[PDB]
Symmetry: C3
């Protein structure tokens, strides 16, 4: 991309891999990662030949969510989580996206992956919707997509308590996602993308449009509710203390 | 035996009726004879309120194989069109609880027909697939509604988009809510469960089932009209 | 009093149901004491997490035999003394640490908690239909809501008994532990919850459960409608007389 922290590779004629590789920030949503992700998805939107997208990280990190400075900015009231929308990239994509989460998925980074149509976790990586550890309520559509993908009950615990779970922990709690050794996750994503690429692209886009119509319809109102909750929770001095203390 | 002798009704006791699909020529694909005999079997059940539980099941290694190969080809090549049909929703429309004892493979519309049952039992060794997209077509027969409803939104996306084949053992490891057993144990477990259902007053079974599946019965027609439109949007 | 209130650390409140005579069935005393325990929590804005739990081998045993016979005769209805929604109506997160058996309305009351823990050795059942009547107490809403549509169908229609270990293998999203570990794990989760600001726990829980709170009243009316059709038959009175405690 421009900032070189996203690499696009056309794996086959109809499969595009979006690899996040902001090594300086461990795939946290730095300004560079934020700009390069939006540019990668726009590229995919401008080039309607692909049948599947693989979204993945580097080494041990899938995506680590807001930077410390990003979160402090929202605490200060300078910015809101909706300012740059990275959470809904894979939902807004017209073709199926596979979030190959071979490494850790933290906060916004985990939630961005959960909006993909197929999610794969690594057994030995850590996944957390850790918003509430810092004193504020989950944003980035976490309160809609977590129950939608992992189910109402596990979502309560994940969102209220902001705990960290190994992929193996989630596998044992019964999640519908494929969970694999980290070394196998991207290979499995490629094979699944090859299978998807056996279909006509128009059938994949028509089908996904139908399957995720209710998510696209329902998400704006939840985003407005989460912004309301941020109004009521984010701006407290103790949120600043927790971000600085516990990040 | 129903008219064409490809569905057999067997009273297990008093109050339990087994509907056994056995179109061996077509491996329980939706031939004309199986379509007719299935509709005739569920009409018989509706006319005979002595039953409290139904067990729908196949023969040997086949539960139900969905569209015939000839039928699918004729659609693919424009000789015919996808219609709406009774079959997928027979178990939902039935007044009393239906157990789909899927002791054999459930393919396409065959799988989907089983999923509309109130209780679904799979076989570990069998293959289950919503394979519509392998033919190039978007899924019909209410698949886009009933697969997310029974197997959850996330696994439904994979099943429906990729049209892959899952062994029962694979789905069991993925976390499905259905009992998964060896094939040789599927029908006996279904008869045990039907016996326990038949301990209940029939009016309470029916009253409860009406309430639990009301949202499915209410929402399904709109989804069918949506699936019909997707077929139009993917045929020039 | 058959409920004891124990403070744990600074802000965790344990509600322990201890009606030993009735094995935590909804006796008049348990009913009144539970209602008052949650009113006490409602009036105390110190607490951040509730642990609702039973004693020894019992979490909660559901309607007493006389309680069921009183609805059968049409003297009462399940909606008369609302225990079913106690955890849902509580403004802070509630953990149902079901270290013992959860039977009928006692299981359903527990399922309304934000976090549910089962015990491997214990028995859980929505057993309404065993007595011939349809499930009340919000069970047709909360069972599919917590355990998913498909498993809820089998649980509610068939009124079967499941060990915690059986539910664990069928794939439930709740943590299932040996009985002797259930309460200790709930305490550790409650300590983790107590790390957050109370206003963030309340704000978030209000949002997450708003759909339950909004939708529950319509389903309770529907369940009353079903009880009008099913509860008041002689064979229900025979089954309650003959099958209660099996």
């Amino acid at each position: 991309m421009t900032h070189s922290v996203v690499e696009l590779i056309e794996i086959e004629s109809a499969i595009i891999q979006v690899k996040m590789q902001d090594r300086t920030h461990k795939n946290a949503f730095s300004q560079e990662l934020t700009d390069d992700l939006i540019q990668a998805f726009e590229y995919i939107r401008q080039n309607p030949k692909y049948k599947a997208v693989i979204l993945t990280g580097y080494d041990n990190y899938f995506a680590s969510g807001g930077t410390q400075e990003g979160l402090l900015r929202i605490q200060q009231g300078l910015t809101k989580f909706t300012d740059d929308n990275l959470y809904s990239l894979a939902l807004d994509c017209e073709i199926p996206v596979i979030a190959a989460m071979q490494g850790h998925g933290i906060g916004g980074g985990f939630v961005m992956g959960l909006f993909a149509d197929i999610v794969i976790l690594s057994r030995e990586s850590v996944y957390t919707a850790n918003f509430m550890k810092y004193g504020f309520t989950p944003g980035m559509g976490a309160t809609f997509i977590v129950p939608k993908k992992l189910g109402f009950s596990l979502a309560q615990e994940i969102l209220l308590n902001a705990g960290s779970y190994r992929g193996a922990d989630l596998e044992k709690r019964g999640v519908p996602f494929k969970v694999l050794p980290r070394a196998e996750v991207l290979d499995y994503a490629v094979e699944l993308a090859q299978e998807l690429a056996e279909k006509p692209r128009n059938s994949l886009v028509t089908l996904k449009d139908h399957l995720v119509a209710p998510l696209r319809d329902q998400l704006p109102r939840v985003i407005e509710q989460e912004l309301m909750m941020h109004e009521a929770t984010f701006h407290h001095e103790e949120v600043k203390s927790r971000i600085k203390g516990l990040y």
